Symmetry: C2
Subunit: 207 residues, 2 copies
C-alpha cells in the first residue's frame, strides 16, 4: 500500500446525504497556511466540489471545486480564485494542494508535488474567520432534511490523506508530501486519522 498509509474513506455514491463532519481540534484563524488532500476522481462535471469550509455570513470562505478539466481554488470569495488548465484526470488517485499568504496575497497550486498555477495579491491582508464548519467532499448545506446536498456539487470516489498546517510548506516538504513516503507527515491543524472524521449518508472507511 502507498504512502506508508493505512486507511481511506469511500464515497460510494453521489447523493444528497453522503458527507462527513470534521471537528478540528484547534481554531482555524490563520494568515499563512498549508494543507493537502489526495483525490481519486471518479466523476468530473462542470463543477465537482472537493471540500467546503463555510461560515455563517460567508459559506465561501474557502472552497476547492473541480470542473471538467480545471482545478479551481477560491480564496475569501468567488471573485478571487486559482485555476489550472489540463492537469486533471479520471479513475486515478491524484495529488492537488497549495499555499497562500495574506502579507502579499500569494496563492499557488501544486499537482503531484509540482507547481501548476499561481496568482499574486490574492486576498492580500485577508484573515479567515474561525469557529466555522470545515466540510469535506460537499458544500455546506442540509443533510438530515432528507437529501439536501445538491448532487451536482457532490463527489464520488475514495478520499484520504487530509492534513492541514498552520503555515506555508516549503518546496522540499511539498515533494515529500507528494511522494510515496508522505503519510507520516500529518498536519497539526488536521492529522489524518487524528482529527475525528465520521462519514455519513453513504460513505464508509476503506483500507
Amino acid at each position: 500500500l502507498p504512502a506508508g498509509c493505512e486507511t481511506a474513506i469511500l464515497f460510494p455514491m453521489r447523493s444528497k446525504k453522503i458527507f462527513g463532519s470534521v471537528h478540528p481540534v484547534r481554531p482555524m484563524r490563520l494568515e499563512s497556511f498549508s494543507a493537502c488532500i489526495w483525490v481519486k476522481a471518479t466523476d468530473v462535471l462542470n463543477k465537482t466540489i472537493l471540500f467546503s469550509y463555510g461560515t455563517k455570513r460567508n459559506p465561501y470562505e474557502i472552497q476547492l471545486y473541480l470542473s471538467y478539466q480545471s482545478i479551481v481554488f477560491v480564496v475569501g470569495g468567488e471573485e478571487n480564485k486559482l485555476v489550472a488548465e489540463a492537469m486533471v484526470s479520471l479513475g486515478r488517485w491524484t495529488h492537488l494542494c497549495g499555499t497562500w499568504n495574506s502579507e502579499e496575497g500569494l496563492t499557488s497550486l501544486w499537482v503531484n508535488g509540482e507547481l501548476a498555477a499561481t496568482t499574486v495579491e490574492m486576498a492580500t491582508g485577508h484573515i479567515v474567520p474561525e469557529g466555522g464548519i470545515l466540510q469535506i467532499g460537499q458544500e455546506k448545506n442540509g443533510c438530515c432534511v432528507g437529501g439536501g446536498f445538491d448532487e451536482t456539487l457532490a463527489f464520488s470516489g475514495r478520499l484520504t490523506g487530509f492534513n492541514i498546517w498552520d503555515s506555508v510548506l516549503s518546496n522540499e516538504e511539498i515533494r515529500e508530501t507528494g511522494g510515496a513516503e508522505s503519510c507520516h507527515i500529518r498536519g497539526n491543524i488536521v492529522g489524518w486519522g487524528v482529527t475525528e472524521i465520521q462519514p455519513h449518508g453513504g460513505a464508509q472507511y476503506v483500507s
Copy 2:
C-alpha cells in the same frame, strides 16, 4: 386557549433541538403584508426569535423578537428594525399584529389590538424575494448535532393563531383579529389548519 380555538403548541423546554418547520404552498413574494399572531411567553430574554424568514444570504429577511420588556420587528436585514417597549409580560396571551408598505417603507406594530410601534422609510420599495424558509422559535444553528440550537434563543411556552397575509390589513381587520371570535379569521398566505406545520424537538400540539 385565547379566544375560541382549541389547538396550540406547547414548547415545554427551550433546548438545542426544539423548533418547528413550516412549508407554505404559495409564493412568498410581497411588496406589503400583514401578520397577526397571539403569543404566551414563559420567560423573555434580551433576544428570543419567535419566528423569522431567512435565506442563505439573508437570515434576517423578515423577523420579530422580544427584547426583554420590548418587541423588536426586524425587517429586511438586522439594520432595519421597529421596536416597542413594555407590552409583553410573562405568562400572558398578547395579540401582536403589524403592517408594512414598500410605497415609502411604512412599517407598524399593534399589541392587544392597539398600536405598538410605527415608522416610515423602512424597507422602502423592498421586495422579499422567493424560495426561502420561514422558521418559528429557532435561529440558524446546528440541529442534527445532538442539539446545537442556541438554547438561549430557543423558546418555551404556548402558541396559536399563526397566520400571514399577502398585503396590508387595515385598522378594522387588525382590531377584529383581536376580537373574541377571531379563531375563524385567518390569512391567505398562511391560515391556521391550512398550511403545513411540523413541530420538532419538543413542540407539541395541545389539541
